[PDB]
Write a protein that binds this ligand. Structure first.
Ligand SMILES: *[C@@H]1O[C@H](CO)[C@@H](O[C@@H]2O[C@H](CO)[C@@H](O)[C@H](O)[C@H]2NC(C)=O)[C@H](O)[C@H]1NC(C)=O
Ligand SMILES: *[C@@H]1O[C@H](CO)[C@@H](O[C@@H]2O[C@H](CO)[C@@H](O)[C@H](O)[C@H]2NC(C)=O)[C@H](O)[C@H]1NC(C)=O
Ligand SMILES: *[C@@H]1O[C@H](CO)[C@@H](O[C@@H]2O[C@H](CO)[C@@H](O)[C@H](O)[C@H]2NC(C)=O)[C@H](O)[C@H]1NC(C)=O
Ligand SMILES: *[C@@H]1O[C@H](CO)[C@@H](O[C@@H]2O[C@H](CO)[C@@H](O)[C@H](O)[C@H]2NC(C)=O)[C@H](O)[C@H]1NC(C)=O
Ligand SMILES: *CC(=O)N1CN(C(=O)C*)CN(C(=O)C*)C1
Ligand SMILES: *CC(=O)N1CN(C(=O)C*)CN(C(=O)C*)C1
Ligand SMILES: [Ca+2]
Ligand SMILES: [Ca+2]
Lengths: 14, 636, 636, 14
């Protein structure tokens, strides 16, 4: 599982 | 200290360094995922920079670039099946992943399978692709090439999937990422650096596709095959569920949406200055960024970067290691988008790098398996590589890596997705990339399952294997920096030249029909051969002690790679100028490509082009021999 | 030996060497005339080669090129006046001379005077030239530029004459020669060498005109003026007989015929090898060929080449002169057709020359008069030049050449017809050309009256004057080869950068309107400045004795000229890549040219171009500063 | 005066 905050590791729209 | 001393000290450091622990640490939540320019990429950049400081390297520094990346946005990325009227029949998938630098567009058409999407895959299809959407399996070539090939046959969009056979993944729903820039670097600063000083003028790379591209799950692909007819050639060796063409009533509509974002990226550097010629250096490099957790993609390489810089710093600080030449350690961002961070550094500091950076060692994907040790590199590095394989041991078997006498003749050239490629093809820095590898591709690359868990489960011996990757690269560093010879084998280019002349000799009739001759190419290959003999003789007679005569000889070695960069093309419009390893109509392969088409006789052959190609390839080779030979007045 | 020792020994040799006798000898019948590639050119080539051998130079050798030249053939070259129906009215002239690389064609139209045919001459005309023939006076710019300017305003042909005022020639019937290639080198091997190994592929230079061009006598011009109306602006300062436009009933028809010949040309070389760094060298060069006898055009320069090589060989063989670096002496052919022999050598051996040839000294037309000493050169050479003028004496007055404190700010840049131009603009070798000169052009250049008789009659002091030209160049050679510093002043580029920024600052409103900024250019100029200070500091602290640290510093000096060669353009399509001294849209002048057109607001300004120009000029400068500054990791 | 053999010094038609 990616962490719940995965979006902070994404420049693409999460 | 002597070679033997340095080999043992390295062996020691290696024996005590903890590789899996470093990789495990890079898979922690703060670093995952770490798409280039994201908060988590930045976090890992700061970690790496801070580690370099702790290692007390001569100097630690960073570069900042603003680059343009087309990324998935909030809108629908979808593939749906549509009756011949446009009416929905079935949504297939809203894919999780995306293909960067895809055209944003919505297109509808037949679906035609093209295997891997190689030129020959396209040649051999019975179904025409003009005006239809193509589906291709991942593998063999880059996404960018798949798309370019398709677009050149007037395809209207592309789907990419992972077949079960080539990619045995339990989960059939798995998403995946990549890019379709046919190139490296920021597509919006072709041939110049993404620095504020440029003020970002309007400028777009020829490598940007003009059709949409999207990754889909195997599940999605299977649903589409269930709407398609025609058995796939069994020599494709895909899954049974494979099919070739949409049924007569059925179309598919691809919608992709993305936005062009300016992203700040960080390259993080350290150097261990040399003791004698500190202004000359090797570069060791690893991609830090990734879509998903990127344990194999970026973490392994980043771990190796870290441990290498640490060990070498200990060796210098503690065991009296005195490299004559310097060692730069580079942690690159935006590798996942096409070696972007590395390329912008090369473009930014070309004037500083020229004949100063004399080799590049890439660390990415150095550990994917344990079966094979595969390498790709400049011929200049083959001998060093050979020597290294003969004295480094496989981590599983206890045997030396050098099993095959003829290994050098099986080496594949660097490709567009490898970060060593621009080092060699654009800046003419001899470069090497290597891995412990299976015959299969490591299937989790570009997916959310590229984790430490998966890596160690698949490679229980990870730590020993990583230790062996590190030893390969460390020996390269030492042989490259410690001695008064470079370990760059210029003689290796003689067999590359033979191969070329041999291939061209097949078309002697075509040459004769054109009133042309091969005498001068033959003669230039002989000049190159003789120039390498003389240089090797000069090495043999040199007072090794005498640092001036050794510098003169070595500086000639340091111009060899450079002189194969075509001096006739615009480095902005054709950056891969290396006539052997680059891309475009100035290369030696391109010259053969063209000439082959003459037998075809379809008016595909361009004779004016071929005459100019032959001229310039001839003189580039002759000019390289002449320069290697000594001073102008000494040429025969 | 010290500078003082070497200066005196040179002075001695000079005092005894016989200049006029050498020039007289080169005007003998075996050598006259000596159009490039002619029997007599070949004869003089063999003489020169044999002399070099007699002088016992380290090595004597020759290069052979086959080049394409369009030359006058057996058919009619004529200008006739024609009534408005085509009926002959009057043959004006069958001219003796011709313009090489003219279009072969016959054209009829009005005749319109355009003074010298500068862009501004064309701007300021009231008569439109679209569709008519132009007449222009020789002088100010090259024939090639005259023609290109005319062709760009859709003129249909060109006539060139020597007006009495600017060219006081008793004989009004005198013919004259030149070429109209807007370029240097063989027009049919643009950007690559004219060597058999290329097999001469189809390839044509952008610099070839597409309209006909012809030289005519003053007599001929006067006959035409007697068919024309309109007084010439008195600020033209031409003769009274001048007029501007053909009368209403009168046309003129120009017919020119020529043939494209493959010609073998010879470059003849000697070298005096250096004692410490023989692989680095200065080049000294003189045109051997000419249409007509070419006493001033080629003989003076060739005489200087010979005597220089002789004296230097004596100095080494007899007086213990030990230059650290080598000296090449080059006798070029096909200079009269646009520095062709020199250009092909540069293109042929670029790989061997790169950062090895560190200066070029041209000798052509070094003696035209006695009034003024004029020089054109790389800024890198200004200080050496200054020092040389302060200690060399005028041959007529006994006074030092350095009269003017501000001389450096009045220097005009090398132009297309000077053989030093390609050395600097294409290969980035600092170069110098110089002369004793009047305010007038020497009127016999390109005519059959360029003889020894005319030269000595006009310049009775010829021998002393030639002796002084030789001393200038000899001092350059010694200062450039003898010391452990180079005498290349990198700091000179700071004022060139100031001038550029100052000019650009005039257009700050335009920059602001475009949302652009000058901060980075300003900042890059400061970086360059600081990098020159540090380097000069490093020189000041260096152990001069220590040959390694002196080589490191000097090698940085030897990259300065090179780093101003634009790395963004194709050297084949834009060979004059030097951003200061070259030609094309990548230069710094071009950037201002474009930006000036914005105020004009005519849609002449190209904003996308200007944005790309600013970016690349900025980074070229920044990149030069960065490289001069030291190692990559040391940049701020 | 050019010599009577001037043409040998000319690649252009004399
Ligand atoms: C260099 O360029 C970048 C991108 O153009 C600049 O960063 C942006 O600045 C604008 C205006 O202040 C902000 O609105 C953006 O959020 C920034 N973009 C990012 C971080 O992607 C940066 O300021 C420039 N640096 C200079 C001029 O020193
Ligand atoms: C065959 O190749 C030649 C050489 O590359 C192409 O010619 C160039 O065409 C462009 C515009 O199309 C011109 O601006 C160049 O000057 C041309 N170069 C030369 C040397 O001719 C040509 O277009 C190609 N033709 C075919 C058959 O595709
Ligand atoms: C190099 O090229 C030149 C010119 O193409 C060759 O000289 C010509 O050779 C032809 C064929 O023998 C003769 O008819 C011409 O008279 C020669 N041209 C001249 C001197 O202008 C020359 O032979 C070639 N050299 C080689 C192949 O070694
Ligand atoms: C203004 O200048 C631009 C940039 O040089 C010119 O654009 C190029 O045009 C060619 C064909 O005309 C294209 O193949 C290039 O890709 C263009 N480059 C760029 C960066 O746009 C443009 O043609 C010029 N336009 C005007 C107003 O003349
Ligand atoms: C958890 C994970 O790795 N992924 C891949 N993504 C990125 O790398 C940006 C996308 N993603 C999101 O949560 C947005 C899931
Ligand atoms: C063909 C010929 O005799 N001439 C006259 N010229 C002289 O110098 C005598 C000029 N010229 C050439 O240089 C070829 C033409
Ligand atoms: Ca770029
Ligand atoms: Ca050429």
């Amino acid at each position: 599982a990616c962490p719940p905050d995965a979006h902070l590791g994404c420049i693409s729209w999460c | 200290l002597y070679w033997d001393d340095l080999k043992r000290k390295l062996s020691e450091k290696l024996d005590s360094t903890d590789f899996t622990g470093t990789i495990k640490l890079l898979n922690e939540n703060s670093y995952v995922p770490r798409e280039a320019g994201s908060q988590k990429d930045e976090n890992l950049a700061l970690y790496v920079e801070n580690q370099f400081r702790e290692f007390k390297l001569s100097k630690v520094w960073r570069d900042q670039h603003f680059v343009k990346i087309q990324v998935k946005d909030s809108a629908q990325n979808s593939v749906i099946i549509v009756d011949k009227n446009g009416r929905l029949v079935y949504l297939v998938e809203n894919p999780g992943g995306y293909v960067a630098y895809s055209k944003a567009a919505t297109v509808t058409g037949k679906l035609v399978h093209a295997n891997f999407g190689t030129k020959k895959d396209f040649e051999d299809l019975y179904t025409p692709v003009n005006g239809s959407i193509v589906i291709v399996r991942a593998g063999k070539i880059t996404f960018a090439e798949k798309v370019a090939n398709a677009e050149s046959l007037n395809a209207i969009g592309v789907l990419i999937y992972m077949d079960q056979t080539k990619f045995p993944i339990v989960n059939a729903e798995l998403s995946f990422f990549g890019h379709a820039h046919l190139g490296t670097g920021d597509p919006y600063t072709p041939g110049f650096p993404s620095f504020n000083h440029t003020q970002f003028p309007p400028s777009r790379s020829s490598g940007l596709p003009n059709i949409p591209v999207q990754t889909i799950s195997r599940a999605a692909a299977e649903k589409l095959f269930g709407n398609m007819e025609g058995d796939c050639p069994s020599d494709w060796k895909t899954d049974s569920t494979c099919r070739m063409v949409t049924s007569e009533s059925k179309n598919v509509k691809l919608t992709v949406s993305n936005v062009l974002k300016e992203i700040k990226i960080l390259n993080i550097f350290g150097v261990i200055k040399g003791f004698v010629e500190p202004d000359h250096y090797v570069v060791v490099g690893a991609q830090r960024d990734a879509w998903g957790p990127g344990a194999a993609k970026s973490g392994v390489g980043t771990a190796l970067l870290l441990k290498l810089a640490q060990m070498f710093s200990d060796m210098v600080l503690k065991d009296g290691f005195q490299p004559s030449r310097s060692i730069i350690f580079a942690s690159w961002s935006a590798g996942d988008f096409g070696s972007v961070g590395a390329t912008e550094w090369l473009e930014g500091y070309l004037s500083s790098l020229h004949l100063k950076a004399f080799t590049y060692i890439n660390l990415d994907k150095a550990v994917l398996g344990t079966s094979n040790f595969k390498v790709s590199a400049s011929p200049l590095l083959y001998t060093l590589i050979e020597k290294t394989m003969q004295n480094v041991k496989h981590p599983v078997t206890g045997q030396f890596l050098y099993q095959d006498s003829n290994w050098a003749s099986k080496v594949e050239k660097l490709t567009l997705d490898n970060a060593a490629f621009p080092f060699l093809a654009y800046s003419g820095i001899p470069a090497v990339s290597f891995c412990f590898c299976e015959d299969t591709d490591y299937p989790y690359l570009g997916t959310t399952m590229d984790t430490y868990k998966e890596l160690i489960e698949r490679i229980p011996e990870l730590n020993k294997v990583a230790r062996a990757a590190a030893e390969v690269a460390g020996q390269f560093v030492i042989k490259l920096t410690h001695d008064v010879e470079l370990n760059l084998d210029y003689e290796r280019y003689n067999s590359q030249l033979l191969s070329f002349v041999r291939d061209l000799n097949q078309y002697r009739a075509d040459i004769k029909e054109m009133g042309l001759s091969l005498q001068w190419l033959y003669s230039a290959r002989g000049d190159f051969f003789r120039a390498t003999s003389r240089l090797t003789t000069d090495f043999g007679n040199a007072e090794k002690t005498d640092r001036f005569v050794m510098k003169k000889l070595n500086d000639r070695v340091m111009r060899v790679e450079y002189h194969f960069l075509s001096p006739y093309v615009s480095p902005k419009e054709s950056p891969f100028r290396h006539v052997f390893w680059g891309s475009g109509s100035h290369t030696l392969p391109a010259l053969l490509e063209n000439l082959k088409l003459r037998k075809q006789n379809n008016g595909a052959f361009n004779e004016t082009l071929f005459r100019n190609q032959l001229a310039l390839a001839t003189w580039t080779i002759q000019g390289a021999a002449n320069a290697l030979s000594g001073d102008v007045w000494d040429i025969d």
